[PDB]
Amino acid sequence: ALKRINRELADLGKDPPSSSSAGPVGDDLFHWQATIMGPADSPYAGGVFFLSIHFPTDYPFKPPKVNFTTRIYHPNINSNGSICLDILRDQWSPALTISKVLLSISSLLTDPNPDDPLVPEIAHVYKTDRSRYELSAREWTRKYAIG
Amino acid sequence: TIDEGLYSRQLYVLGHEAMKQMSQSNVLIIGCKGLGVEIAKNVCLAGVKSVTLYDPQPTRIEDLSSQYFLTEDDIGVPRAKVTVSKLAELNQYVPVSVVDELSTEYLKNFKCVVVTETSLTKQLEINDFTHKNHIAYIAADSRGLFGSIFCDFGENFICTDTDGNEPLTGMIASITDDGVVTMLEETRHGLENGDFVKFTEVKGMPGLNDGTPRKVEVKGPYTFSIGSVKDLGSAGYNGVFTQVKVPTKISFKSLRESLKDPEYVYPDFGKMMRPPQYHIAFQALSAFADAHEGSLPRPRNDIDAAEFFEFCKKIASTLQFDVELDEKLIKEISYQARGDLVAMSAFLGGAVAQEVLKATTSKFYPLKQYFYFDSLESLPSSVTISEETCKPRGCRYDGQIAVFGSEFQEKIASLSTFLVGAGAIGCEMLKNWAMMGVATGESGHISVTDMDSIEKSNLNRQFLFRPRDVGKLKSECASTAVSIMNPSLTGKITSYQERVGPESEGIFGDEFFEKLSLVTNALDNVEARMYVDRRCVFFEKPLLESGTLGTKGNTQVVVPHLTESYGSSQDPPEKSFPICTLKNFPNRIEHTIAWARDLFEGLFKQPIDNVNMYLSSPNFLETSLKTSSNPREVLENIRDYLVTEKPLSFEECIMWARLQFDKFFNNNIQQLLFNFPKDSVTSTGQPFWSGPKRAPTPLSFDIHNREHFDFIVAAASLYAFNYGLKSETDPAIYERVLAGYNPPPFAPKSGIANKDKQELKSIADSLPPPSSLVGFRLTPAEFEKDDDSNHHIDFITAASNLRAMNYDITPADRFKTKFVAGKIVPAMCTSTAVVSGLVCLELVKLVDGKKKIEEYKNGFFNLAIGLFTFSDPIASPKMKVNGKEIDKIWDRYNLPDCTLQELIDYFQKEEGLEVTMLSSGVSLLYANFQPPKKLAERLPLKISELVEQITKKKLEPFRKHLVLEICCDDANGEDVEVPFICIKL
Amino acid sequence: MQIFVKTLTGKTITLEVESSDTIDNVKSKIQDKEGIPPDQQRLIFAGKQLEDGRTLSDYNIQKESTLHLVLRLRG
Numbered sequence A: 001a002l003k004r005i006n007r008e009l010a011d012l013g014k015d016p017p018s019s020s021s022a023g024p025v026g027d028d029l030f031h032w033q034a035t036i037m038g039p040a041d042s043p044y045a046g047g048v049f050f051l052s053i054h055f056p057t058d059y060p061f062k063p064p065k066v067n068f069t070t071r072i073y074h075p076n077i078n079s080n081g082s083i084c085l086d087i088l089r090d091q092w093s094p095a096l097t098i099s100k101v102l103l104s105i106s107s108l109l110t111d112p113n114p115d116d117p118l119v120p121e122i123a124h125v126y127k128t129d130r131s132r133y134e135l136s137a138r139e140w141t142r143k144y145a146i147g
Numbered sequence B: 001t002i003d004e005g006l007y008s009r010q011l012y013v014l015g016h017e018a019m020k021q022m023s024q025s026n027v028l029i030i031g032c033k034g035l036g037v038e039i040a041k042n043v044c045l046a047g048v049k050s051v052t053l054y055d056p057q058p059t060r061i062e063d064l065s066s067q068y069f070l071t072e073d074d075i076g077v078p079r080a081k082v083t084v085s086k087l088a089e090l091n092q093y094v095p096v097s098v099v100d101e102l103s104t105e106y107l108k109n110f111k112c113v114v115v116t117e118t119s120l121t122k123q124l125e126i127n128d129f130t131h132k133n134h135i136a137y138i139a140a141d142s143r144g145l146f147g148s149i150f151c152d153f154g155e156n157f158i159c160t161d162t163d164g165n166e167p168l169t170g171m172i173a174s175i176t177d178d179g180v181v182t183m184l185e186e187t188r189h190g191l192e193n194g195d196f197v198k199f200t201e202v203k204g205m206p207g208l209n210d211g212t213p214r215k216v217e218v219k220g221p222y223t224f225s226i227g228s229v230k231d232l233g234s235a236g237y238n239g240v241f242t243q244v245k246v247p248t249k250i251s252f253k254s255l256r257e258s259l260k261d262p263e264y265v266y267p268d269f270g271k272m273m274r275p276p277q278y279h280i281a282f283q284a285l286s287a288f289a290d291a292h293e294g295s296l297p298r299p300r301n302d303i304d305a306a307e308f309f310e311f312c313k314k315i316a317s318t319l320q321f322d323v324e325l326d327e328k329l330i331k332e333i334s335y336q337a338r339g340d341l342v343a344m345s346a347f348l349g350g351a352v353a354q355e356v357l358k359a360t361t362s363k364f365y366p367l368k369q370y371f372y373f374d375s376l377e378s379l380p381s382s383v384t385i386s387e388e389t390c391k392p393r394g395c396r397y398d399g400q401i402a403v404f405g406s407e408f409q410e411k412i413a414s415l416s417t418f419l420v421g422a423g424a425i426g427c428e429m430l431k432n433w434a435m436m437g438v439a440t441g442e443s444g445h446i447s448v449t450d451m452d453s454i455e456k457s458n459l460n461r462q463f464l465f466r467p468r469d470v471g472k473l474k475s476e477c478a479s480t481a482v483s484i485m486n487p488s489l490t491g492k493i494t495s496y497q498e499r500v501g502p503e504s505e506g507i508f509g510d511e512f513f514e515k516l517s518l519v520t521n522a523l524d525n526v527e528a529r530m531y532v533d534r535r536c537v538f539f540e541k542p543l544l545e546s547g548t549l550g551t552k553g554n555t556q557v558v559v560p561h562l563t564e565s566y567g568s569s570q571d572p573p574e575k576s577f578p579i580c581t582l583k584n585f586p587n588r589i590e591h592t593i594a595w596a597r598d599l600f601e602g603l604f605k606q607p608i609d610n611v612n613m614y615l616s617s618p619n620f621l622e623t624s625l626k627t628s629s630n631p632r633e634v635l636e637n638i639r640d641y642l643v644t645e646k647p648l649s650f651e652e653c654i655m656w657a658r659l660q661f662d663k664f665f666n667n668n669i670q671q672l673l674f675n676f677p678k679d680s681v682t683s684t685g686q687p688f689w690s691g692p693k694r695a696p697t698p699l700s701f702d703i704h705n706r707e708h709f710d711f712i713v714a715a716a717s718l719y720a721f722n723y724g725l726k727s728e729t730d731p732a733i734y735e736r737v738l739a740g741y742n743p744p745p746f747a748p749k750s751g752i753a754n755k756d757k758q759e760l761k762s763i764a765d766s767l768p769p770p771s772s773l774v775g776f777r778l779t780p781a782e783f784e785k786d787d788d789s790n791h792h793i794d795f796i797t798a799a800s801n802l803r804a805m806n807y808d809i810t811p812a813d814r815f816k817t818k819f820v821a822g823k824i825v826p827a828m829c830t831s832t833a834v835v836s837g838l839v840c841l842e843l844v845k846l847v848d849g850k851k852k853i854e855e856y857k858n859g860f861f862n863l864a865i866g867l868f869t870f871s872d873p874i875a876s877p878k879m880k881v882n883g884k885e886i887d888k889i890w891d892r893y894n895l896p897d898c899t900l901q902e903l904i905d906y907f908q909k910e911e912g913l914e915v916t917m918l919s920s921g922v923s924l925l926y927a928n929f930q931p932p933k934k935l936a937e938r939l940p941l942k943i944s945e946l947v948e949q950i951t952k953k954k955l956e957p958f959r960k961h962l963v964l965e966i967c968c969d970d971a972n973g974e975d976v977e978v979p980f981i982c983i984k985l
Numbered sequence C: 001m002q003i004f005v006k007t008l009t010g011k012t013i014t015l016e017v018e019s020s021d022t023i024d025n026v027k028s029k030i031q032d033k034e035g036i037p038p039d040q041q042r043l044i045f046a047g048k049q050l051e052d053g054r055t056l057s058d059y060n061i062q063k064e065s066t067l068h069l070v071l072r073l074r075g
């Protein structure tokens, strides 16, 4: 538990992820505030998203709870910031690092999955009117993901 | 006619048909000693039609060694006459009687006959009649640490359920014309060849929906074959398969016939040569009793042992048994012939009561036929056991002293136990301790803590409570009841009402924990088990864990410095469904139940909380604007629940219920279908509503339908309760009001400055000021499954059924809805009795202070199949630290309250290890990757001061130790695990 | 022709391929270069995922196309 979390934190400290920066809030080891930078060749370019991660007591035998904080216009992300992800439900094993989850979240930001969406209206717009979806996403990432 | 308010937990184990057939059976019980009375208690709680007792023997003092319904004022009275009055109060639906004399013909009046404390000749005479007349005959006996059970249900017993598992069901993707059936993706049917299944809700093959059983050919973990379905169709789309179970015919043999050729059941596979010994030994006991005017051999007597062994030799020769008798074990049985323990009595009573239920319900697989059990490893060896010390002393503990002696009685009488929880297992454990006399000496004590209150549903298996006790604290009732059972425990019991957890450390501190002798868990959640395990590890105290699940049960023993802790044996976690599945794409009734639960919470709980907080917090709106994820949602909820949609009578509540029905079952489905039409395809060209996705269909409100009316009634009742109005149930008013309702037009919408801020301000300025409404509060609807008149389960059932109708899913009745939504754990009284017996049998091992790990046993059992197993505890893992052997669990470092720099220097010097991380709970005190300035600022502080500064919380005055977790690297740079640090403040 | 493929780590890999080359061949090359199994490869170009059994030309992939590879999953 604590040793595994500290090992992950030390590994993150030694190697700067550049595109990511996760760390405990204040001095609490069971509440982290990770930072993600929007991909350049994506509608979310030039945006910073802050996520809250809460580790369960039985970590790593249980997946952590990850929630977005910055507003995002994505098919698989609800208003509450939830994430429609598989590795957090069943594929979770006591072998996946938080860095892998952050990389997966970056990939999900890179390309959505409208086939099994979480926000049906956004998915419908994505499948029907791609340009309107792009414009709305850019407007949102400029209004919310900057400053 | 089944009382679902009392047998709520038992119905999930037995069923409606099982209990209905059980409530028509009469049970006669011959013998009313501890085992007999325990069996009677379990049967009465079970719910049989009636119970008849027969025991004319006058009471004696030693008979109180295990009979908890006898008092010293009852000496000289027949046991049945003084037991019937106390037994009749356990359950109001189970009459209890007493018969003065027993004629053979009278036996025709009963359905089951249980026999204890009867000679072999009388047992044979009774069985020779109860066999050919098709009456169940069960004979039980308990001699010291040995027990025997015999079952005989006739030669043509029909058993319906053979394993206790529900029939295997699954959802079918499609079936070809060759009988090949495949489940959905990554779904295992789990069936085997030769099984029978039935199909329902299959599209394209309606004929297969009739349900006629068909053969099963397992073609793989995900596919199987049923045969030829050419005639009925060519291809079947979707559908559900359900296992079909066929009854089995089991033929028992009578006692007279089974004496010569017995059929044994082995309770443990490491020692399978004992039961042949016990079969002879018990018969020898009966013969010796017949040879000495019914007087059993005196305790630890050599002459009587020799005579008993002679009887054993004669009987073995007579019955042509080609087994070489073991003199040691047989003479051991001779020594304990007059013994009478309460743990063995409880264990065998639970088992035999389960057998009676099997006989009555024609369910589960019964014993076939002999079951001989022994716990001889529990006999103490650190005290003096002989004929001089084991002689009776004329006290109520003679039945135990005759096995253990006075020295072990003193050892027991000075215990200081701690029982956590007061559930069924807690009550049974307390009863056993009261009977054994645990902590009745000068230095003894008992403490029991539990924070729950007695409910009606708890009365089915907690026999220390009564209907007049509903609503009171469990600990008080248990303490008073056990003081009444054993007057010597007056003032020797302390009952708390506190939840054992991190917040109770102010009461259960070091002073409390340093005087205990053992800790016994009776909890039902893993969190408390883990916390208690950590506390025991810190204080090094023996622990007794026990758990049940329906008819399965397990018991574990943790001994300091000897075995591993319970946390290392953590169970797999629970299951949760993807949010995307629950929100939009359900495919099972569980999904709809979870969705209905969320709907309930979001309708009657959260808006109410927001409104109340707005009318309580002076600065609620501003905080919620910049705190809530959807401040607009909060503001709209407040506006709707204050001004826009504030009901004035019940008619408005009905109108609101109709509006909510349309909004949740007609408009949302239309919007979802608009986003994803029924003909939509994926990015790969595959159809969308295929496989795990089912196309929903909007529902039109039909008042005459039952489910719609139920939903309307439930929603109106909950809304009125929220607003504190008066509900009504006559259909006339509902029909009148809902007749004149005009649904507002709705069509799916595609969408397509500071107006938003101005919209929020417009919402806000419409809200009445908090001062205008002072003292006006709305009552949220807190979910409560146990109350049947709060319309909670009704609402969940109605909503789940409606959503199932949306997605063409099979609705479930109120029974299954209550089972799933409330996460009710099935429980039985027999399982409780068995687990209590096992725990109390391990307790005497703990008292003796046995050191070897082969002397302890963790037990597991399943009564649906008559399975019992015992395995040695796992030894604590060891490790190498600084070239020394260290126990991973039971080791710690004890250090004073020194500064951080001194601690680091000590670890660098004494242990030769470099500290890289130091934390205290959930706070990071020190790390090797922190900036130098912060470290230099933190080094000269003492640990207590550092913890207070970092945690922003002063240490409590009662704190006397700190548990620090340290990760340190070796000299080479290799991480090495070390035990925790116990800083002594 | 030549193309560039960008990974989740920001790395760019230059590949010499043909529009008629199958997606299987590209995934095999990617596995050879990085050791990432083809099943776990998710190639994206212009918001479209390349699928096995097709060719680059099927996706209008042309000279020096800035493609991308990301982890595989779903849910």
Ligand SMILES: Nc1ncnc2c1ncn2[C@@H]1O[C@H](COP(=O)(O)OP(=O)(O)OP(=O)(O)O)[C@@H](O)[C@H]1O
Binding pocket: B009, B420, B421, B422, B423, B424, B449, B450, B451, B452, B453, B457, B458, B474, B498, B499, B500, B501, B522, B523, B524, B525, B528, B825
């Ligand atoms: N942390 C705890 N501290 C103290 N007592 C606890 C704790 N957790 C559970 N208990 C007690 O454990 C007992 C649980 O036993 P049981 O499950 O048979 O009863 P119940 O929870 O009232 O009933 P049901 O399981 O039918 O809902 C209750 O007495 C509860 O008070």
Ligand SMILES: [Mg+2]
Binding pocket: B452, B453, B455
């Ligand atoms: Mg309760």
Ligand SMILES: [Mg+2]
Binding pocket: B524
């Ligand atoms: Mg419970």
